[PDB]
């Protein structure tokens, strides 16, 4: 909702409450999953060509008792945009690989989980410096590219570490050395085609015997396709990764091949059914694991839109992973899940 628009400054205050419940034989995901998100997007006109902006988004879980608080910052960044040249922003933001993979992250509840948060340059993460050029100086409609740098996020401070520390340090599964990446997308009418590449130094804390997938750098290569017209949405992405994909709590995959596909239709009366397939196939994993499925599921669901502010959905994760030693060791969910959600948003 735009709550302020005066003398060239605009402020949009937005959010949602998702009354949400999971049904699953897996009791670690089963039960109340209610949550809310809040955010703001602000923009200020500096000149006719130059605009400054900032965005912040926060998630607060609504499913805990009052003696605890489970909340986090999704994004927080400030930036400058110049008409027909580009933009730059810095902060917690999305990695440029997400420019392509976001195209299949459109499912009612699940999806978008061949990668995670704080996972090199694949999704949300800290310390992104992002440069973007839209429409190639305004001379090629629909063509966009981006180049991104990520600074090191290392070991926690004040915990007796003698190397690799940063002020905002964290556990090794969520660390990263310096990284660089890029994306190109082209959209003509309904069609879209895109590609992205990322390369991040891996830290010493990540390259210990306690984690599978030791390596100097984490690399990702992504291609994507999209069709979005005539009430039909189709998209697919394929990603090859090296020492970049987490294998639950075990560490990372030496190599992984990720694939996601989605098909959706929008009825006039407000119903939007969705069908999707995701898989992540790991190779040469180490410790005798050899080749294993990290993720494999079919997602069938539907959303009903009452209007732009109220909707309800059901999403059914038909989980094709089988319960074995590998998935047990990594703590990967192999059970089906049904989600039922009712969402108010502004």
């Amino acid at each position: 909702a735009e709550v302020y628009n005066k003398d060239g400054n605009k402020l949009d205050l937005y959010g949602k409450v998702d009354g949400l419940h999971y049904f699953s034989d897996n009791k670690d995901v089963d039960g109340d999953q209610t949550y809310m998100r809040l955010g703001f997007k602000g923009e200020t006109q500096v000149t006719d060509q130059l605009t400054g902006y900032g965005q912040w988004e926060y998630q607060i879980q609504g499913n805990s008792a009052e003696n605890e608080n489970n909340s986090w910052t999704r994004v927080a960044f400030a930036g400058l945009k110049f008409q027909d040249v580009g933009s730059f922003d810095y902060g917690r933001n999305y990695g440029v690989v997400y420019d392509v993979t976001s195209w299949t992250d459109v499912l009612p509840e699940f999806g978008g989980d061949t990668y995670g948060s704080d996972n090199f340059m694949q999704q949300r993460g800290n310390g992104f410096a992002t440069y973007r050029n839209t429409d190639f100086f305004g001379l090629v409609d629909g063509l966009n590219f981006a180049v991104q740098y990520q600074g090191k996020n290392g070991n926690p401070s004040g915990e007796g570490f003698t190397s690799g520390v940063t002020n905002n340090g964290r556990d090794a599964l969520r660390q990263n050395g310096d990284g660089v990446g890029g994306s190109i997308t082209y959209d003509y009418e309904g069609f879209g085609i895109g590609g992205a590449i990322s390369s991040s130094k891996r830290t010493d804390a990540q390259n210990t015997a306690a984690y599978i997938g030791n390596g100097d750098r984490a690399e990702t290569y992504t291609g994507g396709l999209k069709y979005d017209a005539n009430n039909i949405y189709l998209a697919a992405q394929y990603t090859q990764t090296y020492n970049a994909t987490r294998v639950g709590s075990l560490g990372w995959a030496n190599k992984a091949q990720n694939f996601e596909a989605v098909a959706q239709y929008q009825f006039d009366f407000g119903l939007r059914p969705s069908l999707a397939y995701l898989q992540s196939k790991g190779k040469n994993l180490g410790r005798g694991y050899d080749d294993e499925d990290i993720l494999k599921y079919v997602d069938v669901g539907a959303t009903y839109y009452f209007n732009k502010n109220m909707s309800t959905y059901v999403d059914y994760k038909i989980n094709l992973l089988d319960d074995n030693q590998f998935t047990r060791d990594a703590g990967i969910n192999t059970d089906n899940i049904v989600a039922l959600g009712l969402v108010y948003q502004f």
Binding site: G95, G179, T203
Partner: protein
């Protein structure tokens, strides 16, 4: 005709040398790929350094230079201004002052600069600096004495925009008045003006390296900083106006005698201590074995104690003309060896973590100057009469 500094420069240049250092260090292992839009956060790596130095003893081939140039050197080469080339070996260094001493191996027909009396310097006095700014060679630049500290770092506008802290600072008579340094440590390069150690201090620190092996500077062995640091806040310190003790160094006098992180020193021998700075500088005006009683603050704690040689200025593979980190121990009470390494070439020779060496392979080794004085005269048979407290073994 016209005035010129060329006539005295011709009497000075033969004393200024160029220095090429080759050495290695431990760098972290690069993690790939490299993502420049991802702000993150062991192997030896060779590096090359280059700087200037000044011949200070023509007979012994003693050259003074900056410690930021020769530090970590494996190979140190020297080239005279006439073009003759020589090899050099470390004889001493002192990171505080950023001053180091070296010795040309096999000197022949050398010229030494005359050192002037730093104490007679005054601000409007004329100054001339000589150094190797960007590697391209030996550059001289002129100016005046800008600030006379009053430690007496000399400040002068005879520097160089964006260049590395050269070396010699000379007066209009061609006499050495200071060695230019770099106060932008582990960098080299200036803040905008030039900082030099005064010639009188250079003479003093330099002789110590010669006649002892290192400079007699005692450390209180605490490590810490100001009361602004994240740890002074993250730990909320009461009454803030002193030095914050972040940690007490192991096997130290501060440690031995008594003290623990947190206490904020408030005085040193009665006098107020308002900043680590004040303190770090005050403890630097006291040679080993000295006794300095200081007041701490926890609720109201205070003690008295005696400090030992610092650990910053130490020796390595230059004591035994051969090749392989000792330092001096108290007064002339032998040479105590410190933290041994991983390659263990010297540990492999029966030398632990705290092994003294009073036996000069037969004689008295009250210090590294003496010890090294023997491992240079009789390179034939060597039996190190070492005694690390109790064990009095004799290794080869």
């Amino acid at each position: 005709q016209m005035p010129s500094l060329a006539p005295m420069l011709e009497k000075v240049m033969p004393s200024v040398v160029s220095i090429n250092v080759e050495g290695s260090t431990t760098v972290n292992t690069p993690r790939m790929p490299r993502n420049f839009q991802q702000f993150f956060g062991g192997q030896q790596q060779k590096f090359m350094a280059l700087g200037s130095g000044v011949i200070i003893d023509a007979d012994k081939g003693y050259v003074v230079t900056n410690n930021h140039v020769v530090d970590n050197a494996t190979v140190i080469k020297v080239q005279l201004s006439d073009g003759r080339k020589f090899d050099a070996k470390m004889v001493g260094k002192d990171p505080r002052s950023d001053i180091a001493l070296i010795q040309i191996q096999n000197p022949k027909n050398l010229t030494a600069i005359k050192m002037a009396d730093s104490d007679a310097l005054r601000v409007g006095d004329y100054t001339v600096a000589i150094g190797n700014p960007f590697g391209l060679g030996e550059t001289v630049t002129s100016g005046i004495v800008s600030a006379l500290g009053r430690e007496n770092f000399i400040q002068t506008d005879a520097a160089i925009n964006r260049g590395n802290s050269g070396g010699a600072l000379v007066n209009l008579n061609g006499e050495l008045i200071g060695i230019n340094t770099a106060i932008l440590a582990p960098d080299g390069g200036n803040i905008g003006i030039g900082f030099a150690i005064p010639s009188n201090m250079v003479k003093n620190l330099t002789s110590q390296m010669v006649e002892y092996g290192q400079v007699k500077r005692g450390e209180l062995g605490i490590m810490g900083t100001e009361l602004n640091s994240e740890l002074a806040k993250a730990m909320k310190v009461d009454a803030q106006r002193g030095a914050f003790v972040s940690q007490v160094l192991p096997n130290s006098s501060a440690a031995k005698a008594g003290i623990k992180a947190g206490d904020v020193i408030t005085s040193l021998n009665g006098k107020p201590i308002s900043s680590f700075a004040a303190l770090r500088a005050q403890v630097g005006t006291m040679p080993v074995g000295s006794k300095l009683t200081l007041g701490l603050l926890r609720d109201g704690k205070q003690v008295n104690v005696n400090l030992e040689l610092q650990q910053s200025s130490q020796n390595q593979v230059d004591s035994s003309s051969i090749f392989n980190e000792m330092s001096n121990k108290g007064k002339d009470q032998g040479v105590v060896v410190n933290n041994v390494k991983t390659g263990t070439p010297a540990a492999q020779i029966g030398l632990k973590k705290g092994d003294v060496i009073i036996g000069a392979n037969q004689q008295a080794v009250k210090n590294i100057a003496e010890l090294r004085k023997v491992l240079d005269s009789k390179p034939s048979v060597l039996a190190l009469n070492i005694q690390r407290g109790d064990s009095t073994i004799y290794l080869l």
